[PDB]
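Q: Hi! Curious about what Helper component proteinase looks like structurally. Here's the sequence.
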Amino acid sequence: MYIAKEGYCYINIFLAMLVNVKESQAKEFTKVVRDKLVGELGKWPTLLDVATACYFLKVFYPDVANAELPRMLVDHKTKIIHVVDSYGSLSTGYHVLKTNTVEQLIKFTRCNLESSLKHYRVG
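A: Let's find out. The predicted structure is below.
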């Protein structure tokens, strides 16, 4: 179960993590996402701010680091990254951000180099 709402599809990154949290912790995790993170991030948050929230969750739910992420499609014209767990589009190349797991997103985003990509909006 993913969400499909304008500017809030970054929420699917967090939902993708649920497969790596214990059943005894699922309700609590979902409440952190819904009651804390969404309110702080708002609509069309930057990639950096999303990855930063992932890092926050990782320190409390360490197994989440290995969770696979939905496909992330990049529009360099609008500077927007669309989160899609779907069939028909692109698999590789200039329009697909190859951060396949939480840890990969964290690694990309924590680098000292100032990539323009960190500041694209996600949703």
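A: A fun detail: The CA atoms of residues 9 and 44 lie 9 Å apart.
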